[PDB]
Amino acid sequence: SSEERKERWEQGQADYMGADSFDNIKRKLDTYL
Amino acid sequence: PGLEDWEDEFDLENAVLFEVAWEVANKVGGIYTVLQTKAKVTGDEWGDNYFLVGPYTEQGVRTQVELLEAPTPALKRTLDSMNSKGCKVYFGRWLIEGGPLVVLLDVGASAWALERWKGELWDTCNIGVPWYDREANDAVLFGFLTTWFLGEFLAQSEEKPHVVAHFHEWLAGVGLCLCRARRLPVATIFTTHATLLGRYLCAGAVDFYNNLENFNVDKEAGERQIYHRYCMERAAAHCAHVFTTVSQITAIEAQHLLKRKPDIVTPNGLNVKKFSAFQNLHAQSKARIQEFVRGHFYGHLDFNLDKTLYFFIAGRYEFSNKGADVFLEALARLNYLLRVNGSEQTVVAFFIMPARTNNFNVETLKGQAVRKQLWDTANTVKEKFGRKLYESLLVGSLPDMNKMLDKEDFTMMKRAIFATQRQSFPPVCTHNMLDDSSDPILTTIRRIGLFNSSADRVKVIFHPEFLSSTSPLLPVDYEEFVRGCHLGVFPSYYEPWGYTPAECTVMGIPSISTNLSGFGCFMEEHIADPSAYGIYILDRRFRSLDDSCSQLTSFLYSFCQQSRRQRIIQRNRTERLSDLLDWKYLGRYYMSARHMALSKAFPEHFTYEPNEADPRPASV
């Protein structure tokens, strides 16, 4: 949950199938452009 | 002909260009040469508003960077502020042919901010970086420092100019991402020289180019523990005003893995004037290669050297990516064809690919020494005979040919003849392998049966070490040796842009490339009937491995069947082709990309007309 996801990113266990997939990153980045 | 000031007349006014890259004044790979060569035309176009931003290294600074003082008050204020805020920024000239201004950022002096900055990135793009990468953290620090510098430069400017930033890899994409995050008034361009997943997928995974639409890039990126790097590159490509790739094949690869079609393709160029400093150099180099093969093949010189052809392949020791296996199989097939048809041609192939060696073997040095001894003996006897002939001819008498040779001459020649006795066959490698059992080139040579036998019409020489002018047995650098060869075979499989085939073509040497490489696609697109110009494009994208080997064998056999006049005409046509790879022509795509970025970011002040006009019509 949020900060825990950042921790998992830091230790190298990313959820590339679920919440950490690039869909979230792209939908957040699309606000700046 | 077509120069920079042809049709792109643009209102540059007060605009500043920042050429952000991880590899300025710091030699790592191949884009270093790209930036170093492009700086001249970029500075001619932009004057003194051109800055290259890069990391600070002690070696590079002491070798090729001349530290100076900031030429503008805004730059001096920015440098002083950043240096007093806890950073370390240097300014100077890059001692290259253009002499451009360089801003160097020390990423080792800003570790204290990492724990903060790493958080901010997550509070902006939900991207995390594992602590143990040790190479992505440098990218994060470099990107935050670059964004800081750009923001401070815009803040300290009395009149705010239009800033164009150009980032060149995933190592510099964090700066672009943060520039778009903070909504700075900048125009961002992103250039990819090779997609990150491509080299991972080519090795191991099968049929990379036949499954570009069946790749779930998230899964392969995550499984290879490079998910954060992939997210960095894809985020940088996504939020950029203009996206670019260096080749068409890279354009398809990025469109299918980065999920964004490039707005433009900017190929890599080079300065051809230095290479041009072609038959005198070719003749001299061919004579020296003839001498080397005379030395190597001593005691087995039973073939005509006026009918021998010199092929070569060079580059990094990538067996599959550089297409050496296809070359070896085609060489075996061509050997069979040459033997069956009863030809007088001979083909000596060279494999200049660095490996892990220690020293030369005894046979190669022995052959070079034997050749030197024979040459010296022949010259001695020749000079003595010439003196005797002149003396006997000045008195008006025909030389008695049965007395021009005396006892010491016969002694020298008998020793020389005794020197050239050998029972074995010449080696296929000139060094001592440290992994002779596990070497793929030697394994394939043994498997296909090329042992430099007398009946073999194809001889093979594998020379691991780089060609150097100070080598004991090849006292010549790479360029002069290459100028004497007849053909260069580069059947590359994975190659975003081919520096070696392009360098070979600039020197005027006919070459074989593929449509799976950037140079091959470029030459295929810009030339009609490339084979008439000496460029043989191998259809490797729509063919199997065996079909590719058969086509390569056909190309080699058709090259071997030309007459001498046809070869001369082909090489002249190849020589008149170097201007297609110069930055004087290839630098216009960068100008167009910058114009697109300026018009997209600031549509009020600039407007772009999409003129994509930019050649060799012959035969076909």
Side-chain angles (χ1 to χ4, degrees), chain A, chain B residues 115 118-119 122-132 177 180-183 216 218-219 222-223 227-228 230-231 234-235 238-240:
Chain A
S1 179
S2 187
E3 182 65 26
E4 195 46 60
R5 271 173 56 225
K6 184 178 184 293
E7 295 165 74
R8 302 192 207 281
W9 270 96
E10 294 294 328
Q11 290 100 30
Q13 269 77 20
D15 189 19
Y16 47 80
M17 295 296 172
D20 291 331
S21 305
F22 202 78
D23 49 1
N24 189 359
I25 303 154
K26 182 175 73 175
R27 73 164 61 97
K28 183 174 217 273
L29 272 158
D30 265 9
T31 66
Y32 300 115
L33 61 83
Chain B
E115 56 89 20
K118 258 186 163 170
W122 201 105
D123 291 324
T124 299
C125 310
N126 300 131
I127 295 174
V129 182
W131 54 271
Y132 49 87
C177 193
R180 291 307 307 265
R182 302 189 192 162
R183 273 181 185 74
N216 199 1
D218 291 331
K219 183 168 56 55
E223 287 175 325
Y227 187 47
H228 50 285
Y230 155 73
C231 281
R234 189 172 170 180
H238 172 38
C239 63

Side-chain angles (χ1 to χ4, degrees), chain B residues 48 102 145 220 288 367 391 441 459 461 537:
Chain B
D48 288 330
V102 179
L145 280 181
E220 284 94 7
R288 292 183 291 112
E391 296 299 325
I441 282 185
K459 331 285 188 183
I461 305 179
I537 309 288

Side-chain angles (χ1 to χ4, degrees), chain B residues 250-269:
Chain B
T250 316
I252 296 89
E253 197 202 314
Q255 188 274 331
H256 283 110
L257 309 162
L258 297 181
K259 308 298 199 320
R260 168 151 180 199
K261 180 178 183 301
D263 298 275
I264 192 170
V265 160
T266 57
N268 289 348

Side-chain angles (χ1 to χ4, degrees), chain B residues 157-281:
Chain B
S157 278
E158 294 294 328
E159 58 92 19
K160 280 73 176 175
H162 314 115
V163 167
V164 193
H166 197 156
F167 306 83
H168 269 272
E169 206 67 36
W170 77 273
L171 289 159
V174 185
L176 187 152
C177 193
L178 296 180
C179 279
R180 291 307 307 265
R182 302 189 192 162
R183 273 181 185 74
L184 304 186
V186 293
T188 52
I189 318 180
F190 188 60
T191 310
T192 307
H193 297 259
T195 303
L196 181 64
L197 279 169
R199 65 182 180 179
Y200 282 90
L201 282 162
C202 274
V206 293
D207 291 331
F208 168 68
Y209 284 97
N210 281 324
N211 296 295
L212 267 175
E213 73 275 356
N214 308 325
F215 280 145
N216 199 1
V217 290
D218 291 331
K219 183 168 56 55
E220 284 94 7
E223 287 175 325
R224 282 163 221 271
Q225 293 82 18
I226 56 159
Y227 187 47
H228 50 285
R229 311 183 169 196
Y230 155 73
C231 281
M232 275 196 223
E233 182 157 68
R234 189 172 170 180
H238 172 38
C239 63
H241 283 113
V242 166
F243 181 49
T244 315
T245 52
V246 289
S247 60
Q248 293 284 343
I249 194 74
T250 316
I252 296 89
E253 197 202 314
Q255 188 274 331
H256 283 110
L257 309 162
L258 297 181
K259 308 298 199 320
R260 168 151 180 199
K261 180 178 183 301
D263 298 275
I264 192 170
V265 160
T266 57
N268 289 348
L270 61 83
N271 284 317
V272 187
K273 300 298 188 293
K274 59 164 295 305
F275 278 111
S276 83
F278 263 114
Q279 50 97 28
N280 168 49
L281 304 164

